[PDB]
Design a protein around this ligand. Sequence first.
Ligand SMILES: CCCCC/C=C/C/C=C\CCCCCCCC(=O)O[C@H](COC(=O)CCCCCCCCCCCCCCC)COP(=O)([O-])OCC[N+](C)(C)C
Lengths: 86, 60, 469, 76, 89, 184, 164, 64, 128, 86
Amino acid sequence: TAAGISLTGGRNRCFSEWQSFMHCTAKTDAKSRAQCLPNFEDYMECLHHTKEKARLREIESVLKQKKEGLEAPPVKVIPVKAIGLV
Amino acid sequence: LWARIYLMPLLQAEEDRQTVRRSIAQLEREKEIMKGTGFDVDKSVYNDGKFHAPALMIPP
Amino acid sequence: MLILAIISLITFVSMSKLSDNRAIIRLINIYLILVLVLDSFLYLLFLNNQTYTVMGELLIFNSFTFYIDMLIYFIMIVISSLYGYNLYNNNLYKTLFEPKKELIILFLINILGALLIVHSNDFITLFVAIELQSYSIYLITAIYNSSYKASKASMLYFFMGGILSILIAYSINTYYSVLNSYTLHSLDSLIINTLDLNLILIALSLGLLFKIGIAPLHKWLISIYENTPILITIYISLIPKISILSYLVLSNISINSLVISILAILTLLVGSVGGLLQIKIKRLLAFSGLTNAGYMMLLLLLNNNEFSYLYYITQYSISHLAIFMIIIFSIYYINYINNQYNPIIYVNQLKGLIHDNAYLVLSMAIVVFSFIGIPPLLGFFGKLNILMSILNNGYYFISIVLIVASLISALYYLYLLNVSIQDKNNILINSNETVSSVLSYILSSLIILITFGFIYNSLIIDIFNVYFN
Amino acid sequence: INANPGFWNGPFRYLRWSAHNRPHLFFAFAIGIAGPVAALTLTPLRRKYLYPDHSPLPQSYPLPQRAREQLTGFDD
Amino acid sequence: MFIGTIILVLSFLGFVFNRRNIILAFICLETMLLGINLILLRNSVLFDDISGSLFAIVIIILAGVESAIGLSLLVSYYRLRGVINSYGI
Amino acid sequence: MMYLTYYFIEITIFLAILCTIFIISAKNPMVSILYMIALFVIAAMYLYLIGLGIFSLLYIMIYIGAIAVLFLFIITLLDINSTELSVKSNIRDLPLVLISLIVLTISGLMIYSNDSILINKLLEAFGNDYNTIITQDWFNIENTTLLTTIGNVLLTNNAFILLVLAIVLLLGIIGPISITMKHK
Amino acid sequence: STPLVKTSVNYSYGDYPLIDADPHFKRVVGYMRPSDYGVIGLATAALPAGICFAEWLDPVKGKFARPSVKFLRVATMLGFAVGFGAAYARSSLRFFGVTENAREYKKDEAQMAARKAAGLEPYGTSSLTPELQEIAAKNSAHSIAGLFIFPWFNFVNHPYHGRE
Amino acid sequence: ALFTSLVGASGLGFATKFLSNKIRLKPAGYYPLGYVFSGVAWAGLGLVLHNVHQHSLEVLEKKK
Amino acid sequence: MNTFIIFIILIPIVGFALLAVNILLAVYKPYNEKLGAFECGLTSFNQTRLAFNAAFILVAILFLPFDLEISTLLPYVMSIYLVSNYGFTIVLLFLLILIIGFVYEINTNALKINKHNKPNTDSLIYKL
Amino acid sequence: AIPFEALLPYGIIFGLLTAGGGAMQVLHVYRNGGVRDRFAIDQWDSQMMERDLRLNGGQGRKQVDQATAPEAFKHNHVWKSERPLI
Ligand SMILES: CCCCC/C=C/C/C=C\CCCCCCCC(=O)O[C@H](COC(=O)CCCCCCCCCCCCCCC)COP(=O)([O-])OCC[N+](C)(C)C
């Protein structure tokens, strides 16, 4: 089996969540198995980023509904040629 | 390979320092955008307590 | 043993002349028998239902898979006897039944594909095995390329099986896209509760099930069965059905599925009713196969299906082999040979078979009544076990539909016996040539199993309780 | 004239016949089988007399199999 | 995954509603397999997981063998008839 | 740059749609084979864009270099009859084509979601309005690429699959010979 | 020779104690009993005997003729193959503690004690890295269950033998 | 009883030989040695089944 | 915009430019006799497709499995050190299996075009 | 004798390839700022060259061997924002 192996032969992007969920399933039984629901949730989150996309949708909706200015250290986009300039 | 092994810790330490800095920065930015609204910006989307640098930014 | 036989056969057949064909088949026949009797003891590994993952978790071996492998070996032995042994030694029978040079290799490769499907623990194993079996079966359908019907059938098989292979591949890749996994072992009760896999798993089930021809996608396979040479039809209508059904039984990915319930009902109705107006023997037997596939499809709706599935598939395989052998034996007594690939075509050509060979008709009667389900023949106990399973799990309407389909299909089963026990005007007095001793003994052994196997029912259940619990 | 004398009748005569009359196949086969046979029969001899196998290369950071020591130096 | 999905669906519709020639059926099979492989490879990239790419490689090899056998079947079918009808099957 | 180079993936998608339509509508089946070759070049373009240029090269090597060549070889040697696309023959399919298009496309986008509600299932399909953050680390010291990793897992973790594939290729030799050659 | 993964310890495959969960090919052959060699000889005889007896029952060409020597030779080789497979499986099942294994258990105890006296690894030194040893063990362990389908053997000196 | 199992299985073999003689349109006692061979073979199968069943019962009892 | 992409764009441009120059500068005077296919100066009748030999089909069909066999060794040569001795054994087994198929092809004489007409070797016998 | 007119076209080909390669080498070195090209660079080398750009002020492959980084190195870190692979 190639499960857990990344494109470079190491551990794939979501290996940690999957391994913690597998630890959970190994320690519990069929009756207790639902106790492992959070771990599996985290695993699926890593796979698909669904809650993260929802949270970003919420933040962006509130952002585009604001005319007041933002005063925080910002993000700046630069050309690849300008990596390290100035 | 052993030369790269001996350089790995300092490069990863620098990168970890940057990961922390930018993650905390993004949390501060988002909580400032969400000020005045009923939404927790500090609540993780994961259930474990572990540090999770963001994937998935808003396009700049 | 199988891989070794395939390698050795390719070399040996390459260095052999076309006249050695039957001899070569005989050799492989005895080889298979030896493997069955010297390697049987390995059943001990599975005492108390011990399961083994093998090949880096690509393969799964348990008592269920070991039994299916033994059954497939037995079927291959029986079918290869029909190519290695002449029914009669006259010129007509040389023309009717001559094995092709590469047919034995194609059979052994197809058997390998089937056994790999049965043991598949990962989806990549499943897909490679499915394509191995599919490609082999296309080539088996085509290898009698002087026949127009066989070549057309092979093309139809290639295209429909390709579309269904694509459906299976797409199912597997959607499963991977949802779970980042290729194994059903990663499914838990918690995962099944948390996620909706039903559409993916039913898509996989349907892709597999349409490949053995359940309704409403039954006509294409029935056409292929009609249009192949009869000794090819005996093989290709049985082995894929066993392999695919066994995999689905062991996987249990469609429990209490509404869609599978509806398709099983439709399959029972189509198989029973659509067999009624058939006048060709192979089309009649193909509709019988469809109905028995619906019976076995019902077992995909429940857990703890192993005993009833294994019993049903075993007795059905025995009966299918017996009825095809009887039809082959009756060729000697018919007036009109339709062509060299299908010497007998119409049920009416069996008219008055009792006056030519009474005990052949007794064998036919036993097999037909087993298909109907008369006790104490094996078919009755197969149907009884299936009814116990489905009523234990609340499938009441389906049990009624099962009863109705059984009654309806009895009509076309009795058609064979009915014409076979009527009178014919010119009956056989004597003939100097006797049919082969080997094939007659094999047919008689099958008949005796169908007749007296029930005597071992309680002993069989006792053994099953220690190897499957 | 020359014709296949049958391998099973006599092995060495058939091998001679092949080397004389089917050199392409004969030497393709000789070269092909030389490899695995040489591997099985010669690699232990090379290990015993010529040189042993080399020490493995690291594939990742070699993590100590131990507990963290308390250490001192370069502090804040 | 859009490009693979569209390729697969359109190739399937072309196969089904083909009423023109048998080569179109062969082509639609090949391109349905291509679409499936594209979907799989995108998921393999997004998970950083070698299993998808391994399956894609196997799919490529099997598509080659399936092409070889399908065209052998077509040639054997041609041998008896000398032509392929626009219903040639 | 940016405008074109941002929508390269979308351009490949549009070109793929067009190429499939041209495959199905071609008058000459040889022209259909050529449009299939075009579709495979487009697929190689997409695979390069998502980071799999090795699969781009493999697809060019195998599907164009081998499979399309066999396609053309066969259509050259064989006598094929074909009819042209026409209203008389094909407008009768338009209702079923439309219903099937909508149903199959929507379902193929919905099979990926994990939401209970069907409309949410379909909505998640069009839900990537966000950029992925690409980050660096220093844990990989070897020069291991996709091809090397495939070799590593195929020859060790999944060696059985390689040997079974060897049997499948054996079939791809023995079968064609069995049905295209007449012995004796 | 240090295992990378946790294995079960002295697990019961049958009614007898475990000797070796994935015995090396050399040990499986070396521990064979004279009865296993009788099996090999029986299969080597049985396959050509079967081909001749089949000829007798129902001649391929009407008149009985002894099968030619090419078929007898192929039958002898394939019969030896079946016999060796059966003998290998019988010895293996003794190593799993599925059949009776007292003689083998004693002999393994003596052999391991001698090697420990000699300072050697109980299961030998491998030319493979431990990761490849693990993959090899997970490819060969219990592969004898697939004897009907394919042959697979343990040729690797790995540490994953299921003992203490 | 093992002896009764052997008699019954040998009778199954006798029935097989008889039916094969009849299907070949031959008299019941056509090649009487075949009755012995068939009976012996089917008795062997019956013996194998009997031994496997006995072992199964032994196992079921030893877990008590 | 590295040299690779610029060069790859530039090649077809030059081909098209040469084609355009030829179209622009050469005369173009088609007429019926010039438009005939050149077959040694004569005209032949249109014919049903020639019946071909099976070896012609077989070379092209067998190219694909052998090509796939060869190309499946690319992952091995790119991973030889990593898989060293285990993978070396595995790749040997894979090669041997494919060589059995090569043996089948060679012994069946699958790519040989047999000259159908052969000299008659029958003796001349006279009934005296 | 050696036929020199038959060698003239070979000489033209040899001279063209030689001069083109020498010119290409000079152009590559000039593009590199006075050093030879890098070849067969893996992901590690790619990241190292990006870090070099952050340290030397965007001056291509210029190297600096001073123990301590400048202040700007703390704040010219780049993450990449990759468009959704649809
Ligand atoms: C000396 C070597 C001869 C062995 C060769 C066997 C070849 C099998 C060929 C064809 C299959 C026919 C049916 C197999 C019998 C099942 C045995 C069993 O009890 O099945 C059980 C599982 O029950 C089931 O699921 C239900 C099975 C449904 C059977 C339905 C047919 C009943 C009628 C048969 C009457 C018996 C005739 C006896 C004649 C005196 C598995 O038993 P097991 O896995 O522990 O293996 C047995 C130990 N063995 C390997 C040494 C033999």
